[PDB]
Ligand binder design. Structure first.
Ligand SMILES: Nc1ncnc2c1ncn2[C@@H]1O[C@H](COP(=O)(O)OP(=O)(O)O)[C@@H](O)[C@H]1O
Ligand SMILES: Nc1ncnc2c1ncn2[C@@H]1O[C@H](COP(=O)(O)OP(=O)(O)O)[C@@H](O)[C@H]1O
Ligand SMILES: Nc1ncnc2c1ncn2[C@@H]1O[C@H](COP(=O)(O)OP(=O)(O)O)[C@@H](O)[C@H]1O
Ligand SMILES: Nc1ncnc2c1ncn2[C@@H]1O[C@H](COP(=O)(O)OP(=O)(O)O)[C@@H](O)[C@H]1O
Lengths: 416, 435, 416, 416
């Protein structure tokens, strides 16, 4: 229905990965210890490279990716790096397994919506449009500020026309009388000039097209979970998007580009979810499914207490290419902390970076990285421009980590 | 594009890995299997057991009896089923299915089981169709958003170029179409048939003289007939939220016309093979459907496989061998596969490398066999693909041990990946040795 | 709706019991060690006789039968022998408890269908029909090949009539013009002769009548699970069958004959199933319910972990007459093997019968009986007419039994 | 809806005017005493010429023609000559005033139908068609007997196409399978050759187009007053004809050619009829209305006994150009008789022509012209090839004229 489509992204998810520019590999596919925002995790980064190469070589027939590692081992980051290495403005949809558990929306219906967020359209266009109110009198149309040798349609002279050089397309306000009321088919005279050249460049996903056409002005609807039902995007609407998208591809105007669907907490998905993904991997049009698990052994959801590897069923595990993600060294953590500081704008003493690293050692990277923002407030409130070890020591006491938080609440001889 | 015959759809989601299997690899008189023939290698007892089973069906010594293939993971259960399927003919329908696929939010278990069986029962009619026969000159493959190609086919008198869709390219690659082959394409169905080759290659019909109408046999499954007469499943149907369910009114219409053609003599029903992987995954309700369906005369050969010794009968609180209803175990014919010897494993991986067009150094296959021993054939077969690209990156003539070492170091098997995640979060044995 | 009804039977179920002709009892109700296909199981065969006598004496008011024994102890056979001893062409419907678990069909709706398979109609008729296109001119009608002293209905001379001697019943193609189009009530002239005598003999069950009237040509529908819904046989249709069946009985034309409903795996049935059967046993018209259990103690399905005898609830067990079925001796097994061989057409050496018996000792009769068919193939393929001990030894290795099959898969110190 | 339209004409009306080829005038517009089938009536023929000249000069703005004369003074003939002088294959619709009095059809609705019979379409075409089942592979389509550098529509290769050189237009039986039933959109392969050249020439009236499109095979419907209702041609159907006819003219394919509506017995028309004709004369598209009256003074139908000239109301008479038609001399009659004889095939003696003329003197030309056909029968039955005075004398006694017929019936002293 609409050509000028506005793209929407859940930026809060890709907020902590502002520094990851790519995998940081060389020409021969070997990861440089510190490159493109990455610090360490060389083997896993290399394995992600082999994956982006296989996709480009078209050998990932009906195969997936399983990122097995502990919390804060750069899984979501490697997933983002895969989309970046695949090409420019490639769709990246990071979701968790717990997200699929929706009260009003069916488990696979949410999975379907995120698949549409991971399939995009690259529209490279240079529209040479000639519009305005109209072999003798070959060309002659007028705009609101202008007038300007040279198919034949059911339109007479004095009507507003719109015709593009690459593809041919189809009464004006000037002759409309007040005596004629609502029998009206009168359009106003086009603004600007007759000869228009537009650099049309769009990188929108199927979901961006669905959400735009669901709107009959919309920013509030985007900034809202307005109604409990949320019955706007329908099967008929999705089909209409698919038919008009197929037309754009058949015209060679747009490129259907499959992205990366990243599913963290993969063990949360059930048999019904995994069978939806099996059917997805079969499609050539489908994006790459990158799964993540911090679980060694987990029960198969939708199975009679059958415990398996990472909580992924055997049938689906077969398809997956398991990549292990290692924990970091206190030195490795310090680098990541420093990179995060410079991206966030904050700056701290080597001693403050040392204490943040100490928290990144016991508790994950994720917790200690959260310690920068309150300490920046603590330093600035005092009158400092640089964060000190005292502010990290204050922030660790003010804001606790899930494990430490629970242990003191139980304590009001803890083991296992 | 008008219809899609049974041949081109044969074991759709499992054909690639089992492409080398051209049959059961047995002698026709004495049913004794040859150590390595028709793609199959070293699973002698299972292959002979399967051969005895197929003859029992032909002879009519068994009726309403399913086949069960029990063995460890990566021991040729899916392979012997494909070998049984191939030995029945190319115009016999063959449906592959993971028992899990029945449990989906998109369609009901009954619908999923219906489609499964309908896909494995073919309808044979002799009808006129335009057949395009000729010599392959050039095949081009360039992978809207997906594969698009060109086929330059010739006859001694005509030279033409044809653009190909995703479905055709797949069928061409399934039949392994090469420049020089003599092939016939059914224009109504899309059926690619290798007749010969104009010029010999890698150790014999002449280029055809004269697109021609002929009275040809068309074997099309009940599910495809359902699909053709149903609403066209559009582009991006998987991500449109539209269920692949067939409307009852359409099924009724097809079932009546098929019953009419059978009675009239216009058609003959060709029961094929339905293969169900992970049977321990099916419930009490599912097996009952299989019971009812197996009682029919048009019932396909229900072959099923399990990796589990004892499993719970899903839907009940009872346990049994392979998790099968105890009434069902009595009727079924049980065939057992065993692990392969290192020598038996190397032949298989070498065959799979040929089907993947990958050149392994003598030492690269040896490590690929040591890997296959410990972590099974499946993981090892995936390593070939990765090693090919790690060697290609460093611009190698063959895939070396260094590359097989890389794939194994970069990509983990489930046993190592669980061991990884576990030891990284919790230490079982302390620095002193104490647990 | 239809008189000429075609009967349908699930023969695969009664395939292994081709030799059981009856119970093989004497005049005084004592079982002969080897008679009517049976070998041993004398006491249980005698107890089944007492049962067929009680049914004939009408003392099985609201009582059932429970066959308690191990796998392959001739339970299904004794059940078949009960229908045979009850009389000629008596309905026998063998079903398992697991069959009732249908995805689209309600648990009791399948139970209801099998009850209809166990209630039949004995139609003994000699129709003295006088048909053809028509006190002065008493009798005079013509057929396609013939013409032939002697109620008064709304039919004139020149119309096709059909009247039977026992019961009186009611325009021809000959006078139909092409100018009259579709206002038509014209029937063709009957083929054959005017005076027809037909030996009408039908032994069809209620289910055979339902399936015939569900058809508006049907063999394919019989050889199919055509649609996932299967909404052909309806409540209104069943009622219509019952009303027309009642009319046939009231005319003394047909006999409503209750058969035998055999339910194997009786422990699989729940409280809702058992209450359906309680209501069934109450009816005089109802067939005999013969249950079977290879379970000593089993949980009551639909009850809070209440373990009871054979998994049958107390209320229903009360009604049942429990008959125990014993295992066989290696000599007893050899006889059964020999009887099965001669029925199947196969023939083997005394040594091959000995090895089949050895498998019938450890594993049940059911498994070793399955060893005949592949060994027949193994012998014939070699060039033999008689099966040897070598072929039984090959078949036992080629085709495994459920217990042996599972044990090797677990082994890749097994106990209990 | 249809291009290939079959024209229908009421030939019985134009039967007696087979000899009138035109007005028979010279270069300076003066009538030759004997020319183009005409004999005498010079002044009236000249006046009809001035009329055909005025129509060609476009000076008959909202004017009509009134032919005032006695019975058989060549009024209908002059009306036919007007259509012939106007050009080639110009529509000519002769009707009487009494025809308008229809029981089921409204007075003006019949008048409207005859107006459509008097407005035609001249379709001069040379269709350069290239049809058959289908910049690389530019042109390539096949017919049933043939196959044959070089807009882009929603049609793929292997579909039946139809495209003309002057105007561009839009699946085959060859790929249709029996498994696909009624989902069908399959068309057969076109017969003949790919490159077709057709000399399309059509001279059909609006009525011919209406009657063809009323048909959903039709010759019987033409040879019938099938139903008393006759509800086939409707307002919506007429509008659809008008819209598609307007499209043919806008394309310069067809010429809308207004003909001649001849209304004899003009005095029979009422005020409602005359107001329908007033509105008609106003239209530029409208055909020429040629009225005829043998009445000097007649009452205005639909007016309170207001007697006026020829029974035409003053308002409508004003618009009319009155042309008087004179009676003939016995010599003039003889010529007409001779011309009619030679057209009809009959031939008679000068003495027989003399007697026919004697009847054309007392009674009109119309009666005596009817005397040829029975006399031809009377002569041929005798054994003659030429009609004699005896046969004319017999025919006059066998077949009477309206006036003579009535006078003897009254006589069983007649005056005024
Ligand atoms: N090797 C690395 N180099 C740079 N930043 C890293 C690295 N590993 C993790 N991070 C960063 O640490 C933070 C948390 O790690 P994350 O990607 O969420 O891991 P996980 O998905 O395993 O929890 C993110 O900001 C991420 O970009
Ligand atoms: N006997 C065999 N001969 C040849 N290829 C085999 C044999 N057994 C297994 N394979 C191949 O090894 C791979 C994994 O074995 P598969 O049959 O899928 O195992 P499973 O027993 O788990 O069903 C496949 O590519 C399969 O074709
Ligand atoms: N006493 C017997 N005499 C003859 N055949 C028998 C006897 N007991 C069992 N059989 C046969 O053994 C086979 C399996 O026994 P079956 O009746 O199914 O027992 P169960 O119902 O207890 O499993 C059948 O072919 C049956 O007829
Ligand atoms: N001047 C004439 N020349 C030739 N034929 C004539 C002439 N006048 C009349 N006729 C013919 O006489 C016949 C009857 O005359 P008609 O045209 O019907 O006159 P009206 O309409 O006044 O009754 C027709 O066959 C007509 O063609």
């Amino acid at each position: 229905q609409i050509s000028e489509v506005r793209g929407n992204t859940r930026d809060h998810r890709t907020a902590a990965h502002t520094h990851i520019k790519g995998l940081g590999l060389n020409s021969s596919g070997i990861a440089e210890k510190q490159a493109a925002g990455f610090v360490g995790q060389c083997a896993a980064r290399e394995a992600c490279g082999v994956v982006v190469d296989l996709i480009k070589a078209h050998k990932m027939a009906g195969r997936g990716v399983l990122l097995a590692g502990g919390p804060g081992t750069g899984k979501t980051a490697l997933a983002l790096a895969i989309s970046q290495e695949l090409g420019t403005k490639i769709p990246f949809c990071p979701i968790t397994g717990s997200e699929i558990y929706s009260t009003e929306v069916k488990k696979t219906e949410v999975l379907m919506e995120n698949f549409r967020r991971a399939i995009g359209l690259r529209v490279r266009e240079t529209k040479d449009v000639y519009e305005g109110e109209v072999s003798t009198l070959l060309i002659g149309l007028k705009s609101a500020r202008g007038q300007k040798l040279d198919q034949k349609e059911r339109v007479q002279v004095g009507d507003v026309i719109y015709i593009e050089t690459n593809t041919g397309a189809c009464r004006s306000d000037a002759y409309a009388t007040e005596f004629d009321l609502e029998a009206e088919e009168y359009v106003p005279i086009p603004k600007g000039e007759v000869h228009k050249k537009k650099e049309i460049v769009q990188d929108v996903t199927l979901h961006d097209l669905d959400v735009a056409n669901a709107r009959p002005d919309i920013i509030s609807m985007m900034g809202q979970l307005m109604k409990p039902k949320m019955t706007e995007i329908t099967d008929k609407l999705r089909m209409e998007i698919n038919k008009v998208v197929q037309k754009y591809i058949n015209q060679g105007v747009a490129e259907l580009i499959p992205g990366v669907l990243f599913i963290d907490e993969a063990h949360m998905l059930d048999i019904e979810c995994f069978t939806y993904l099996n059917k997805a991997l079969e499609s050539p049009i489908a994006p790459i499914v990158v799964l993540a698990s911090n679980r060694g052994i987990a029960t198969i959801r939708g199975a009679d207490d059958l415990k398996a590897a990472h909580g992924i069923p055997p049938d689906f595990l077969q398809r997956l290419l398991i990549i292990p993600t290692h924990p970091y060294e206190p030195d490795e953590i310090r680098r990541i902390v420093r990179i995060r500081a410079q991206t966030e704008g904050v700056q701290l003493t080597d001693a403050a970076v040392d204490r943040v690293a100490e928290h990144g050692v016991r508790i994950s990277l994720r917790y200690c990285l959260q310690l920068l923002a309150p300490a920046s407030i603590l330093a600035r409130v005092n009158g400092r421009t640089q964060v000190d070890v005292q502010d990290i020591a204050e922030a660790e006491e003010l804001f606790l980590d899930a494990r430490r938080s629970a242990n003191i609440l139980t304590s009001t001889g803890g083991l296992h | 594009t008008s219809v899609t015959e049974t041949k081109e759809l044969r074991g759709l989601n499992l054909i690639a890995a089992h492409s080398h299997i051209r049959g059961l690899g047995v002698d026709a008189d004495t049913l004794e299997p040859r150590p390595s023939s028709q793609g199959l290698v070293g699973q002698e007892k299972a292959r002979k057991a399967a051969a005895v089973v197929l003859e029992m069906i032909k002879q009519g010594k068994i009726a309403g009896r399913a086949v069960l293939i029990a063995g460890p993971p990566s021991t040729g259960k899916t392979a012997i089923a494909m070998g049984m399927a191939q030995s029945l003919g190319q115009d016999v329908p063959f449906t592959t299915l993971a028992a899990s696929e029945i449990f989906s939010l998109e369609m009901s278990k009954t619908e999923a089981l219906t489609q499964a069986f309908r896909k494995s029962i073919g309808v044979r009619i002799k009808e006129e169709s335009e057949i395009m026969e000729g010599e392959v000159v050039e095949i081009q493959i360039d992978r809207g958003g997906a594969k698009q190609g060109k086929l330059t086919i010739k006859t001694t008198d005509m030279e033409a170029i044809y653009d190909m869709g995703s479905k055709m390219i797949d069928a061409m690659t399934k039949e392994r179409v090469m420049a020089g082959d003599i092939i016939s394409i059914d224009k109504s169905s899309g059926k690619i048939t290798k007749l010969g080759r104009s010029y010999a290659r890698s150790r014999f019909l002449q280029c055809p003289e004269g697109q021609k109408r002929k009275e040809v046999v068309h074997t099309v499954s009940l599910h495809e007939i359902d699909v053709i007469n149903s609403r066209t499943q559009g582009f991006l149907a998987l991500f449109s939220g539209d269920t692949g369910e067939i409307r009852s009114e359409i099924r009724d219409q097809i079932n009546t016309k098929v019953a009419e053609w059978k009675e009239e003599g216009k058609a003959e029903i060709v029961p094929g093979v339905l293969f169900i992987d992970e049977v321990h995954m099916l419930d009490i309700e599912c097996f009952s459907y299989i019971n009812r369906a197996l009682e029919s005369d048009l019932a396909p050969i229900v072959i099923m496989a399990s990796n589990r010794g004892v499993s719970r009968i899903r839907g009940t609180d009872y346990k049994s061998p392979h998790g099968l209803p105890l009434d069902f175990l009595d009727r079924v014919v049980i065939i057992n596969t065993h692990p392969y010897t290192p020598d038996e494993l190397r032949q298989i991986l070498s065959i799979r490398a040929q089907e993947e067009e990958v050149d392994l150094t003598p030492d690269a296959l040896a490590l690929l066999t040591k890997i296959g021993q410990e972590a099974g054939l499946r993981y090892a077969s995936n390593l070939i693909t990765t090693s090919q690209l790690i060697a290609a990156k460093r611009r190698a003539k063959q895939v070396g041990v260094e590359d097989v070492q890389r794939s194994f170091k970069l990509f983990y098997d489930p046993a190592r990946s669980v061991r990884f995640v576990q030891e990284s979060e919790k230490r079982l044995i302390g620095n002193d040795g104490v647990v």
